[PDB]
Amino acid sequence: SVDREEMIERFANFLREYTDEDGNPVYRGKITDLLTITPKRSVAIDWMHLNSFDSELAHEVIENPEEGISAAEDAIQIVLREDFQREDVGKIHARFYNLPETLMVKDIGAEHINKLIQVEGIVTRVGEIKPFVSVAVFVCKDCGHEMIVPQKPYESLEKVKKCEQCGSKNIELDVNKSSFVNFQSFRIQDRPETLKGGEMPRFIDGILLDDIVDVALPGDRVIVTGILRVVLEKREKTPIFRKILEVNHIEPV
């Protein structure tokens, strides 16, 4: 595998050195598109491009998307700061597309836990759009000490109940110091044309965050990239799990 530290350097290098057939540093381009007036907040990375430049790393984003995606986003921040003189910029998403293999919803199982997968299907439902606290900041009213707690949309809220410093239970979530982003759930299932006779379509529920919410409507057929996550059944007293697709990239077909 590839150490975190090293994974960043290699991403930063891919970002600033990969070129298409005509020689253009395509990802410098995309990074530049973050600075324009109506700017994007993601950099869509074509997996085949990454694989053609550094295949070891390209396979590690599939085996370890959590660390791989995050290293890419740190690289983006570096290139911005160092090549564009831009520290002020916010969170920028590294969104991978065009993976080597495409699953159908019915093919998704336990083998895929915490790996980056690509699914083709049709959107059955979309939820309403709600704020999600991606970074909760809890403040102690007794001593003013702040405790930062990052969150995951598929997991439950990680609270804190004692000030790290003073030990009192007079802690509350501080909304203004906390960081929120838009959240939207959706269901995707197999396309009816790929089903055989009276075979029953399987589905999977997904999560969209930030700039990729509200990109799809029921009926839309899409190709998505995401991390398959698991959470215990609502009982939480069974070793069976519910599966959720944390979306990394999504496009219509």
Place this chain on the structure above:
Amino acid sequence: SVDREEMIERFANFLREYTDEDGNPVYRGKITDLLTITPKRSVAIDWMHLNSFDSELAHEVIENPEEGISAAEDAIQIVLREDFQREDVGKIHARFYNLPETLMVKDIGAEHINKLIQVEGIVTRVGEIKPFVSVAVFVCKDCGHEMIVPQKPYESLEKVKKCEQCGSKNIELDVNKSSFVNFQSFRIQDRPETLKGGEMPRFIDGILLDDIVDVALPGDRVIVTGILRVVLEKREKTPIFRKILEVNHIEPV
């Protein structure tokens, strides 16, 4: 940003010094209307007036409406006491209207948390009108010590369970010493004319307090100003949030 202390002085100054084209101190006028026989209990402030007099402050009421609104209300109280000889008067609301940008319900997301926004839409529902304890006063039956606890309508009731002074758990809410105001909930959603084809209208729930309750009926189309607030989902074990619009100003169209 603008310090609290300073924010008041500048509001008081705007209130007593801003004049229209003919020279009339319009807001002295409005403040005067609080003293008449059937008096108003708000002062509607035209944001464009404020911006034309003190734009820095006008932008701070949008970025920090909680402190900005409250500073304006303190200013109103000053001008009353100092220019009209009136301390006896109660709570007077500073209600801002005519903000620079107007959202549709569907445009409201996490970017708007705790900021003053302006929404145009059509009222789907209105709740029944109920008392809300804006200032709870809990009294200790064992030593007579009183503890004041201000409240927010969108948050849950902040109780107290131990006398600050004697430490006993013989504390109850004292209704007569507490301060109540009328409360009314309502739902607003996108106007059907702004929807495209078979697009689905999104909605947002809101809270009306005091003198602006019962100003709207289902079917009414309105322009409202308010603070977008968030509260955790009813589970309270998810980092997803429900959004509520605490209304500052409302008018029919």
Place this chain on the structure above:
Amino acid sequence: SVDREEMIERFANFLREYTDEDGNPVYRGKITDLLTITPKRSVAIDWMHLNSFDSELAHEVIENPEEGISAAEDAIQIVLREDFQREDVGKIHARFYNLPETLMVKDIGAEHINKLIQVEGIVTRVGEIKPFVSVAVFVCKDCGHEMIVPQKPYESLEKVKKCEQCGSKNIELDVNKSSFVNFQSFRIQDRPETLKGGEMPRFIDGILLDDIVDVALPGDRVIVTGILRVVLEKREKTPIFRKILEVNHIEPV
């Protein structure tokens, strides 16, 4: 305002000294009607009579009906004992009618909390009639010590869980030593003739006790006097309140 002690003396004086145009001490009359064979257990007091004799006191029954009503009832008990030689008589209600202003159900809001109001409306529902423990007496089985706890019909049951004297948790409500009275709930709403076009009638729930239960049927149109009371929403974790009208006087129209 008017001190309790003093409020009684002034009520007793009004009761025994107020006379109509022909000179008859009308309230001596009414008090006399308590001693007859099929006796009344209330004394209906005409507010305009009280106001014409002692307006300061007449306004204090509206601002402080809880203490005002109770002082009147103590006055009744005095006049009985002193002018009729009657200590044996029970609880006798002071029931005020004919207040200066009449509200419609829709006019009732937070301004009216714990004040005596007069409402005109039409009875939508009446509940079944049930015993209410107006004075709970809890007895300790370990030492025989008795603890008296008065109750309110709109509030929850104030239990006691430790003998004041011995400290044991072997306390139960003693039914025979406790005092019960009949209870009946009812709903009143605006009369359809006062509504405008397709306007929606608002309602308010009420409580009848003792001799005024079973005085009304659904469909009856009535004028009632009562104290507007508030109790927290069933959740009890919101600062919103449910309103209940504790009836002091009721008559058909």
Place this chain on the structure above:
Amino acid sequence: SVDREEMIERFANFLREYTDEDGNPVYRGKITDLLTITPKRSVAIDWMHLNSFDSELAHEVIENPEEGISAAEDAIQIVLREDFQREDVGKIHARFYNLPETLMVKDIGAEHINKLIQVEGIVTRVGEIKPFVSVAVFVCKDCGHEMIVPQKPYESLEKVKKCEQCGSKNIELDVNKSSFVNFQSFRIQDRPETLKGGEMPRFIDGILLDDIVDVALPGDRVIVTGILRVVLEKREKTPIFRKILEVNHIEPV
């Protein structure tokens, strides 16, 4: 008796207005002696002077020496600040001498508790001189909150075990922020010349603080003024008390 507030004004007035036979404001003199190069830190007040100027107050210093002494010291501070322009000066002791009645050690009993008495006797013992924390300042290491706790030399150390603010038990006495003064114990007993035949001399233990420590040696015969204080026997489970003389003034004879 004489209210605290008023007691100060009257002391300040005595200090600045009392004059001897030749007209000299003797106590302005003494106050001046606090500003010289080797300055005193007490002002010895002749009780007969005080009595001749304001006898009511002179009797209150005997009945209520704790409040009387302290009011005098506040007066001294006023006169300094207002007549000499001196706020910088420290604690200055008001030390009364020449009381109307002089007891022998054997005459001291329970009648004298918390009253200013004057005793003549001979010093049997003197203890070693030690620091006494007259004002303990405890600091919370978890939130930096400081709690001031004044002390008495005859009582035990009043600790604090929970931060007032954060509630943690991480509180310690801060030596540098606390205020210390020298302390010395001594025993005084009846002079052998006043004893009759083979009568046994009684004794009483005393406390000297600050500038009056080390003023006496065993064998010295002295006249002292002090407050008689009581503390429970070392067992602390008997209602019998040990008596200690908190010295206010001391002189050799």
Place this chain on the structure above:
Amino acid sequence: SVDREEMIERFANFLREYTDEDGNPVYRGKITDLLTITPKRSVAIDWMHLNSFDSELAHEVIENPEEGISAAEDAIQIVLREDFQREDVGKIHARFYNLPETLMVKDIGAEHINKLIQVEGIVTRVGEIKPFVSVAVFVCKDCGHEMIVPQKPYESLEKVKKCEQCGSKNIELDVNKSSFVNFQSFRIQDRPETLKGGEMPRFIDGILLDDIVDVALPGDRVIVTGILRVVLEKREKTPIFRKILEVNHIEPV
């Protein structure tokens, strides 16, 4: 006063720049004597030298010897590392002598708490020499987490009872990782030649650490520099204190 950071720079500068009449950087010399074969582990600093170079700082070592002494020792470590290429060297003591005023034991009182004083007297007793843990290192046997706790010889042992990290009570003092130094107690009292007639000599107990233990025998007459420290009486329930002299420098006369 003088900030810590700044206090170091000024000490380092004094150490490397102060010169005697002939121009020799005397303290470079002394620092050099730390590197020789039988090396010293203190640098004796002549207070008059320091005062003649930087009097502000020289007075701060007397008012704040704890921080002043420590800043000097950090300066020594800097000059060693930077001018001699020596990081490997251990703890080196900054020991001040020749202060402006010399007390007799009997002059030492509460005014001197936590200040550097100089006393002349005769050694009455010397204790046996024992190890003192100047830096206690407690190790958690459950997770291997180490907690460093510096100690003071006059205070009691600051234990730790819960692993900072894992929270278990399976913590013990680790002798090898902890730092020990030799400790010796001694009593010093007034010299009989300075006593008057039959006056009684007072004494004070002291602590010697590390390289200055075993420097004195009973009967030796000495001049010592030290910090006067206080600790509560053994009862620990009285606000009286025992005084101990933490020795910084000692020499025979």
